[PDB]
Amino acid sequence: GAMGSMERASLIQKAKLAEQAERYEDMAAFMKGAVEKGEELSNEERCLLSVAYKNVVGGQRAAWRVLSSIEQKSNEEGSEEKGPEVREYREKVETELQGVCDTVLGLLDSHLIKEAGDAESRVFYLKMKGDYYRYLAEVATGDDKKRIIDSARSAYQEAMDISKKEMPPTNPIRLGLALNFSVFHYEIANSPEEAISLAKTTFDEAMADLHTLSEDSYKDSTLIMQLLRDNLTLWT
Amino acid sequence: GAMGSMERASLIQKAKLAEQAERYEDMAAFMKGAVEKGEELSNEERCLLSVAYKNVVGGQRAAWRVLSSIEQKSNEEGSEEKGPEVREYREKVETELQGVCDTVLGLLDSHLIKEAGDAESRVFYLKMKGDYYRYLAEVATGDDKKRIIDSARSAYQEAMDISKKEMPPTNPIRLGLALNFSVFHYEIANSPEEAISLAKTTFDEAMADLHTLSEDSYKDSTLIMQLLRDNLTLWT
């Protein structure tokens, strides 16, 4: 790797600078280098890794959606043949998106997940695994589409099982996992009722636990609870 | 070039798609490929080229400024030594920015400018040459800094001479050239009085010519005139 010669601490420092400069591709490359040093990541470092790749893939997904919409309109009746260019360029963006997802999944499988024993690390990484399979599922159309969807489901489900046993209902990672798995149900698995039930039960169980929290923890938990409520409002 | 196998028309089509998807690095790569086909560019194609690179380099400049500010604060008295990382990362972004500027200047010199005979093409390309030397000047510190500044000045000056002879005072390219050359005077050449005089005289001479224009041309010209006014308000 091109980051193999840079100190771990320097990679982390530069990831933080890249975040300040909104240079998310750089941030992701620095964090990939840090992961590849082979040591486990701290809570803050896991956040740097996830923020970097979430921003990179989020931009790719937004671009893919723009191009896919143009492509769909081009294939409507009465539209003029514009040639292969829209499909080609959508495919180019799609292939780059798949490459980034494969890279993240590769870091998780070699070897972040297998060395993650605490709930706060293991749930976070398994949630990421579900997220990146979900992004692959958003663009999938081939023989393996059902297996891609099931890979996302399986990762989210393992994260859910651990989170319910090992974290309080207000834990922000537990809440964010539930938020995203609920979106998986709604958008990917054609299961809007499961999506709504999960978001509602998660919200209600968190509400009942807020009384145990400090002011700062309350702010953290209610932030994610509001996202669950926002999705429920969208879906009902 | 990696675009050598793609049709000119397909590169232009994909540049337009990349713009819609806000994929400006792709847009610039497609337009570089189109330029390298060796044919002159139309007015619309010149705009695609300039928009693509303006957005790429604009993002690099914003990131460079963030990192340079951090670097300056790190070199103040009482600040803790953080190591070489801030300088290294600022240098990384700076080198990438210089590479993009060199690429644009290379397209202009091989061979867009020499085949541009009409004022609307030649002024536009010479303005771009001034702009990209100006971006090089923003980061320059070495033996060649004065020559870089003078290269920007010389390109802007040739564009100005042509624009005053061959374009009406309301022509948007003439106005945008004056806007940017005025910024060059203020920010690069330490000549705020020249910057203010140029912006004011350009604005006033355009105002006096608006009566000749259609409603649509009036909208185009007044848009750039407002930018001149905005800069004058900032500077006075």
Place this chain on the structure above:
Amino acid sequence: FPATV
């Protein structure tokens, strides 16, 4: 699109 984190 719905919210995810």
Place this chain on the structure above:
Amino acid sequence: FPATV
């Protein structure tokens, strides 16, 4: 920063 086009 001042405006440029």
